[PDB]
C-alpha cells in the first residue's frame, strides 16, 4: 500500500516467503535491502570451546 | 579431474560474476556453489610438489563463507571475495602445474600429483558441478567409455617429414623418377618428378602414389586439395639418400593427370575423389592415398617440345604436384592444432621449471616425436595433461 | 528448429550439470526445464529414417519426472537422469540425421522430416528455451526479418577455379599476354604475364584486371594482400584453352605496379586500396576488382637487360602477381569455412547412409558446384541442414 | 565499459531466452536483471554523437517492467519484451559506434563518448553483472593492473615489410650476398642468397641472420618452422635500394644449414631450437633471431657442379630459406588476428561514417602503421575500441 502495489496474492504452501516475493518486486532500494537482509538473516553455526 | 575442473570453474564464475553493484540474484547459485567449495576444502592440507624447479608449496584452507546479506554487491564484498578467490586460484594453478609436469607409463590417465589424488577422494565430490568444457566433457565421456570427440582446426596430425623416394636413379642423378613430399602438421605437399618426362613410359604415363598413414582416425574432415605443389616447383640442390653427394632438380610443372585421392579406413575405401579440387569431405579415415600421373602432353608447341627431348640430357624435369590441407577434423584422441594452446601451455610449464625427461614424452615435449610414436600410454598422459592445461587456462 | 534445438540444449545441459555430488541449487532451473521437456514429449510417437540406408526407428516417450529432493546429487539421481537423457539424445540424433538428409525446392527452409514437422506443432512450444548458439540465433533473427550474421574464419566463398585468359596469343603460344588465376576457398592468386615484357606496350606498361564476383555479400572482412603470387611463378607447361596443344610459361617475377584493390557493392566502390599490402578491411562488398600493371624497369642491370630482348623469341616472361586471402568475414548467408564442420557433418551423414542425389544439392554435396549455383532455394536448404548439424554436434 | 557490456549481455540473454512457451523459471533471474536495467535507465536522456557522418540520436527510456506472473511465456510477453529489447539494442549499438570512432591521447582507456561517460556514473553501476567474455575479463584485469591474457589464432604481430639487405654488392648487381624477407601478419619468410655459392667464403659457409623485434611480448606461442621460403625461390627482377636500377635473382635452393631459432625476451634467450622443423613452442619472447648457413655442398654431381662455377659469371644463385608461422599465441595486449573481427568492425564503422583522422590512430586504421608505432596511448585506445567492438558484436 505504501508503494501503490496491488495486494500480494500469496498462496499457502509457496516455496518463497512473502518477503522474498516482495524483495523481488520492490523497486525502492532501502526497503528491498532490508527485505533481503531479513530473507537471509541466519544463525551462524560455530564450534566455540 | 572433475573436481579440479569444478574448482577452476567456480573460481572463474566468481571472478566474472562477483562484481560491484550486481544483484544478489545474479550470483545466488554461484555463492552457494562457492560456499560449498569453501566448506569442502576447509581443514584440508595440500602440498604441490617439488618436481624439477617447481617450488614445494603448502596449502591450508580456513576461509569464511561468502555473505548472503546484500541486495547488490558492494565494493567491500568484492574485495573479500577477491582475497579468497586469489588464494584459491593460486592453489588451483599450482595443482594444475604439478599435474602437468608428471607422467606415468602404467596408468597415465590416472592423477599423478598428490593433490589431484587427494581431490579424487569422495569427500570432495560435493564440489563437482557443471562440466561444460569440451575437454572435461570428453574426459567424462571417456571415463564412461562413450564416443569422445575433439574438434580441431588444422590438426597437427602429420609428423614433420621432408623426404623423397627415387624409383629410378643413377650415380650421376640426371635420369631420376620418383616423388618428394613434405608432411607437416595438417598439410601434405607431394610431387612426382620424371626427368625423361615419361618418354619411354608404357603409355607415356608415369604413375606416382603417396601413402600417408595417420596415427589416429580422423572424422568429419574438411580438406582442401589443390593441383600444384608450390614447395617442389623451384630449382633445388638435394642431398643424396646416403648424403654422399648432391643432385640437381629443375622442375617444370605439368598438370597432374588422373588425380585420385582415397581416404581409407582399415585398408577399405571410405572416400574417393577423382579429378576433384577445392574443398572435399573425408567422413572417417586413417590413411590417405594420393595417386597422380605425369602424362606426356600428346601435343606440344615448339617451346614445350623443346623442353622435353627424346633422350638424355634432360634439363627441364617434368614434375606434377598435389597439395592437401586438413582445415578441420574430429578425432577421438587429443591433438595439437593451430587454435588450441594446450600443447604450448604444457611445454611452457615443463620448460619454465626444467622438468627432467620422463618415461612417456619425448625429451622436449617435441610434437614430431610424440605424434610419430603416439602410443596408448602417450595418448593417456597427453589427454590428462591437456585437460589439466585447459583447466589451468580457465584461470591463468 | 527452435524446439529441436531446445531439446538438444536441454540434453546437453543435463549431461554437463546433472553430475554426482553437485548442489541441487546448481540444477534446479535445469531440472524444471528437463521435467517440462518430459511432460511435453510424453504420450507422443515419432518415426525417423526410411530414406536411403537410414533405418526406420520408432520413438515412444513415457518417462517420469525428477521429483527427488536432495541437497547434493547422488548416484541414483544421476543414473535415472542418464537413462532418460540417453534415450532423448538418441532420438534427437536420429531426428537431426533425418532432417540433414532431406531437401525440397519449395519451402526448403521449412521442416522436411516428419518428426521435425510434428515438433513444430504448438503443443511442443513449451519445450522451447534458451536459444544462444550462433546458428539458432541467426535462425530466429531471420524468422523475425532481422539482419543476421554468420562469422567465418576463412570463408569458402570462392568456388574452385584455376583458369587463365590470353589477351594476346597465337598458335605458337610464344608471344602471350594475359592473366592466370586460382580462386579457391578464401584465397585468390592472380598473375598477369607478358612475354614481351611490355617492350611495345604504350608507355611500356601492361595493365591487367581481374574481377571476382562473390555469390554473397561479405562484410567486416579482414583481407591479407601480398604482392606476389607464388602459384604462378615457376615454369609450367599449361594446356591450350581448347586442349588441343600445350604452351610453356617461364616466369620471372616483377613487383606489380599501380596495384589497386577495389571492393565493390552493386558496382559502386566501397573500399579502395592503392599500393597497400598486408592487412586491409573491406567493410561491405560483393565484388573484388584487382588492377595491377607490369611496368618495364626503366633502368636495368646487364643480367636484367639480357632477359628482355626487343623482339621474339622471348624466353623469360615478365609476370606480376597478387595474392588475396580473406582471413575472416561476416556473411548473412551460411557458408563453409576453415574452422567449422557443419558442411562436413552433412556430407558425412549423406554419404554414410547412401542418400540419393536430390533436386536441390549437387551430388555428394560438392562445395564448388553448390557455391557456384548458390540459389535462394539452395541457400534455404543449406541453412536448414547446417542449423540441424550444429544442433546435432551439441550431442554427437 | 562494464555497464555497457552488462547492458549488451542482458540484451543478448533476453533475445536468446525470452522465447515463446518457455518456463518462466528459465528466465526469472534474467527477468530480474532486465527489470533492474529498465528501472536504472528509465528517466535518463542520452545523446549519441554527431562526429563524422554518424547522426546525432536522442534516447529516452520510459519502459514498463517485464511481467513475472506467467508460468510459461506467451506471445504477448515475447512481443512486449521484443519491443523493449529492440529499442535497447539499437541504443547500445549506437553507444558502441559512438565510442568506437573516438580517441584520446591522455586518457585513451577512459570513456570518450557522452553516453558512455554518463553510464560510468554511480547510478548505473547496479546494472553491472556477469563479465565473462574474454575482452571484458581482460578489461577488468587491466583496470586492476593484473596480468592480462588475449589468445590469438595467427596474431597480426609483424608489420608488413617486404625488404632485402645486401652485404656484398656491386653496381652491376651480379655477385650479391644478402638476405630477403617478408614479414607478413604471422609469417616470417626469410632467405639468404649467395651468388658465388660461398666459393670464397671461409670454410665454404655463408652465415645469414635475421632479427625480428616484436612490438609486444608473446607467450605460449605455437610456431611452425619450415626449412624453405617458397616466396624467394623463383626468379625475380628487383629494384635497387635507391630504385635507380633493377637487378636479377635466379635462385637455386639448398638445404639451410645450422638452422638456429632463438626466441628472446629483453635480449635474454628464452627458447633455442637447432635443426628443428615442424611445431615448436616459444613460451615467452619479444624477439626472434633466425640464424642459418648456406654450406657449399662438398660433393656435387655434374649438374650441381655445373650450376656453381669457381668464378663469375654466376647464373644460379644459391639460396637458403626459412619459414616461420605463428599459429597461436598469447599477448597481454589486444592484437588483430585471423579469427576475430574487432579491427575490421572498428575500421568499418570509421569508414562508413567518414570519421576524420584523429590524434591517436593512423589514417584509415591501417594495421601496419598502427602496429609499427604501437605506443602505450595507442594500446589504451585500441583496447578500449576493441572491447567496445566486442560488446557491439554481441548484438550486431
Ligand atoms: Cl588458418
Ligand atoms: Zn641419390
Ligand atoms: Zn592458348
Ligand atoms: Zn585458421
Ligand atoms: Zn642493389
Q: What angle do CA A44, A45, A47 make, to 5 degrees?
A: 130
Question: How many CA within 13 A on the CB side of residue D12?
Answer: 22
The DSSP symbol for B187 reads E
Question: How many CA within 13 A on the CB side of residue D46?
Answer: 26
- The count of other CB atoms within 10 Å of the CB of residue C165 is 15
- Please state, in angstroms and rounded to a whole number, the distance separating the CA atoms of residues C284 and C267: 12
- Please state, in angstroms and rounded to a whole number, the distance separating the CA atoms of residues D160 and C226: 9
Query: Is the preceding peptide bond at D313 cis, omega within 30 degrees of 0?
Result: yes
- Please state, in angstroms and rounded to a whole number, the distance separating the CA atoms of residues D288 and D290: 6
Q: How was this structure determined?
A: cryo-EM
Q: Which of D281, D233, D346 is nearest to B366 (CA)?
A: D281
Q: Which residue bears the cell 619425448?
A: B362
Ion ligand 2, residues whose Cβ is below 5 A away: B 240
Minimal-distance CA residue of chain C relative to B155: C339
Quote the cell numbers at residue D117.
561517460
- Please state, in angstroms and rounded to a whole number, the distance separating the CA atoms of residues C179 and C93: 49
Dihedral through CA D94, CA D14, CA C155, CA C331, nearest 10?
Answer: -50
Burial C204-218 (b: 16+ CB within 10 A, else e): eebebebebebbbbb
Q: Do chains A and B touch (3 or more CB pairs under 8 A)?
A: yes
- Please state, in angstroms and rounded to a whole number, the distance separating the CA atoms of residues B135 and B391: 9
Minimal-distance CA residue of chain B relative to C9: B132
Quote the cell numbers at residue B281.
569431405
- Interface probe for D, chosen from B253, B348, B349, B353 (most Cβ of D below 10 Å), is B348
User: Which three-class secondary structure state does DSSP give residue B101?
Assistant: coil
Quote the cell numbers at residue C212.
571476382
- The count of other CB atoms within 10 Å of the CB of residue C86 is 13
* Beta-ladder partners of D295: D205
- The count of other CB atoms within 10 Å of the CB of residue D44 is 16
What resolution in angstrom units was achieved for this structure?
Answer: 2.4
The three state secondary structure string of chain C is CHHHHHHHHHHHHHHHHCCCCCEHHHCHHHHHHHHHHHHHHCCCEEEECCECCECCEEEECCCCCCCCCCCECCHHHHHHHHHHHHHHHHHHHHHHHHHHCCCCCCCCCCCCCHHHHHHCCHHHHHHCCCCCCHHHHHHHHHHCCCCCCEEEECECCEEEEEEEEEEECCCCCCCCEEEEEEEEECEEEEEEEECCCCCCCHHHEEEEEEEEEEEEEEEEEEEEEECCCHHHCCCEEEECCCCCCEEEECEEEECCEEEEEEEEECCEEEEEEECCCEEEEEEEEEEEEEEEEEECCCCECHHHHHHCCCCCCCCCEEEEEEEEEEEEEEECCCCCECCCCHHHHHHHHHHHCCCCCCCCCCHHHCHHHHHHCCCHHHHHHHHHHHHHHHHHHCCC
Dihedral through CA B265, CA B271, CA B275, CA B280, nearest 10?
Answer: -110
Contact between C109 and C118 (Cβ < 8 Å): no
The DSSP symbol for B145 reads T
C84 contact partners, CB below 8 Å, separation of at least 6: C34, C38, C63
- Please state, in angstroms and rounded to a whole number, the distance separating the CA atoms of residues D102 and D212: 32
- Please state, in angstroms and rounded to a whole number, the distance separating the CA atoms of residues C20 and B83: 29
Q: Which of C46, C13, C23 is nearest to C130 (CA)?
A: C13
Q: Which of C182, C124, C142 is nearest to C333 (CA)?
A: C142
> How buried is residue C120: exposed, middle or buried, by Cβ count under 10 Å (0-12/13-18/19+)?
middle
Taking contacts as CB-CB distances below 8 angstroms, the residues of chain D near C278 are 159-160, 184-185, 367-368
Quote the cell numbers at residue D92.
547500445
Contact between B116 and B99 (Cβ < 8 Å): yes
Helix (H) or strand (E) holding D84, with range, is: helix D75-100
- The count of other CB atoms within 10 Å of the CB of residue D75 is 10
Looking only at the bridges linking them, the beta strands covering C187-194 and C205-226 are unpaired
Question: How many CA within 13 A on the CB side of residue B125?
Answer: 12
- The count of other CB atoms within 10 Å of the CB of residue B61 is 18
Quote the cell numbers at residue C395.
550431442
* Beta-ladder partners of D237: C254, D248
* Beta-ladder partners of B329: B152
Dihedral through CA D338, CA D343, CA D349, CA D353, nearest 10?
Answer: -120
Cα dist. B349→B133, B372, C182, C184, C365 in Å?
Answer: 22, 22, 43, 40, 44
Taking contacts as CB-CB distances below 8 angstroms, the residues of chain D near C129 are 17, 19, 22-23, 26
Contact between B389 and B336 (Cβ < 8 Å): no
Looking only at the bridges linking them, the beta strands covering D268-274 and B158-168 are unpaired
Task: State whether residue D68 sits within 8 Å of chain A by CB.
Answer: yes
Roughly what angle, to the nearest 10 degrees, separates helices D24-41 and B24-41?
Answer: 120
Contact between D111 and D100 (Cβ < 8 Å): no
* Beta-ladder partners of D175: none
- Please state, in angstroms and rounded to a whole number, the distance separating the CA atoms of residues C158 and C160: 6
Q: Which of D133, D130, D98, D132 is nearest to D117 (CA)?
A: D98
- Please state, in angstroms and rounded to a whole number, the distance separating the CA atoms of residues D287 and D266: 8
Minimal-distance CA residue of chain C relative to D366: C280
- Minimal Cα–Cα distance from C11 to chain B, Å? 12
- Minimal Cα–Cα distance from C268 to chain B, Å? 30
Q: Which ligand gives the minimal distance to the CA of C241?
A: 3
Contact between C231 and C189 (Cβ < 8 Å): yes
The DSSP symbol for D345 reads H
Contact between D193 and D176 (Cβ < 8 Å): yes
Dihedral through CA A40, CA A43, CA A46, CA A48, nearest 10?
Answer: 150
> How buried is residue B70: exposed, middle or buried, by Cβ count under 10 Å (0-12/13-18/19+)?
middle
- CA quadruple D301, D303, D307, D311: dihedral positive or negative? positive
D9 contact partners, CB below 8 Å, separation of at least 6: D129, D130, D131, D132, D133, D394
- Please state, in angstroms and rounded to a whole number, the distance separating the CA atoms of residues C122 and D21: 9
Residue B376 CA, ligand 1 centroid: distance in Å: 29
> How buried is residue D368: exposed, middle or buried, by Cβ count under 10 Å (0-12/13-18/19+)?
buried
Minimal-distance CA residue of chain B relative to C250: B252
- Please state, in angstroms and rounded to a whole number, the distance separating the CA atoms of residues B129 and B40: 13
**Phi-psi region for residue C370, left (φ > 0), alpha (ψ -120 to 50) or beta?**
alpha
User: Which three-class secondary structure state does DSSP give residue D119?
Assistant: helix
CB contact under 8 A, B26 and D222: no
D377 contact partners, CB below 8 Å, separation of at least 6: D105, D106, D108, D360
- Please state, in angstroms and rounded to a whole number, the distance separating the CA atoms of residues B209 and D360: 57
How long a stretch of residues is chain A? 49
Q: Which ligand gives the minimal distance to the CA of C304?
A: 5
Which residues of C define the annotated binding site?
A: 153, 266, 286
| Chains in touch with A (≥3 Cβ pairs < 8 A) | B, D
Question: How many CA within 13 A on the CB side of residue A12?
Answer: 0
How long a stretch of residues is chain D? 396
Quote the cell numbers at residue B27.
550470483
- The count of other CB atoms within 10 Å of the CB of residue B27 is 26
How long a stretch of residues is chain C? 396
Q: Which of D:5-44 have CB within 8 Å of A?
A: 32, 39
Amino acid at each position: 500500500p505504501a508503494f501503490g502495489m496491488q495486494r500480494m496474492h500469496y498462496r499457502n504452501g509457496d516455496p518463497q516467503t512473502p518477503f522474498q516475493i516482495a524483495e523481488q518486486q520492490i523497486q525502492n532500494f532501502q526497503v528491498a535491502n532490508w527485505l533481503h537482509f531479513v530473507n537471509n538473516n541466519q544463525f551462524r553455526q560455530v564450534v566455540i570451546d | 579431474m572433475d573436481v579440479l575442473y569444478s574448482l577452476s570453474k567456480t573460481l572463474k564464475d566468481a571472478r566474472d560474476k562477483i562484481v560491484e553493484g550486481t544483484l544478489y540474484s545474479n550470483v545466488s547459485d554461484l555463492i552457494q556453489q562457492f560456499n560449498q567449495m569453501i566448506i569442502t576444502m576447509n581443514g584440508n592440507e595440500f602440498q604441490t610438489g617439488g618436481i624439477g624447479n617447481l617450488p614445494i608449496r603448502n596449502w591450508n584452507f580456513d576461509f569464511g563463507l561468502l555473505g548472503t546479506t546484500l541486495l547488490n554487491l558492494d565494493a567491500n564484498y568484492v574485495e573479500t571475495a577477491r582475497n579468497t578467490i586469489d588464494y584459491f586460484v593460486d592453489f588451483v594453478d599450482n595443482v594444475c602445474m604439478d599435474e602437468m609436469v608428471r607422467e606415468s607409463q602404467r596408468n597415465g590417465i590416472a592423477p599423478q600429483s598428490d593433490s589431484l589424488r587427494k581431490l579424487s577422494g569422495i569427500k570432495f565430490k560435493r564440489i563437482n558441478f557443471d562440466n561444460s568444457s569440451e575437454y572435461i566433457e570428453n574426459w567424462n565421456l571417456q571415463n564412461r567409455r562413450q564416443r569422445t570427440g575433439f574438434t580441431f582446426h588444422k590438426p597437427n596430425i602429420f609428423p614433420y617429414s621432408a623426404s623423397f623416394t627415387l624409383n629410378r636413379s643413377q650415380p650421376a642423378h640426371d635420369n631420376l623418377m620418383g616423388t618428394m613430399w613434405l608432411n607437416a602438421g595438417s598439410e601434405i605437399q607431394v610431387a612426382g618428378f620424371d626427368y625423361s618426362c615419361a618418354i619411354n613410359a608404357p603409355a607415356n604415363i608415369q604413375q606416382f602414389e603417396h601413402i600417408v598413414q595417420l596415427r589416429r582416425v580422423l572424422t568429419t574432415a574438411t580438406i582442401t586439395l589443390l593441383p600444384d605443389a608450390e614447395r617442389f616447383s623451384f630449382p633445388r640442390v638435394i642431398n643424396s639418400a646416403d648424403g654422399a653427394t648432391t643432385w640437381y632438380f629443375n622442375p617444370v610443372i605439368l598438370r597432374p593427370n588422373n588425380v585420385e585421392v582415397e581416404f581409407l579406413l582399415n585398408g577399405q575405401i571410405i572416400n574417393t575423389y577423382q579429378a576433384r579440387f577445392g574443398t572435399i569431405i573425408a567422413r572417417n579415415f586413417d590413411t590417405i592415398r594420393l595417386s597422380f600421373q605425369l602424362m606426356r602432353p600428346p601435343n606440344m608447341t615448339p617451346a614445350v617440345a623443346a623442353l622435353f627431348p627424346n633422350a638424355q640430357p634432360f634439363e627441364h624435369h617434368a614434375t606434377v604436384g598435389l597439395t592437401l590441407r586438413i582445415e578441420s577434423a574430429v578425432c577421438e584422441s587429443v591433438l595439437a592444432d593451430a587454435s588450441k594452446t594446450m600443447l604450448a601451455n604444457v611445454t611452457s610449464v615443463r620448460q619454465e621449471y626444467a622438468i627432467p625427461v620422463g618415461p612417456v614424452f619425448p625429451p622436449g615435449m617435441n610434437w614430431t616425436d610424440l605424434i610419430t610414436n603416439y602410443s596408448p600410454s602417450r595418448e593417456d598422459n597427453l589427454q590428462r595433461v591437456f585437460t589439466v592445461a585447459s583447466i589451468r587456462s580457465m584461470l591463468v
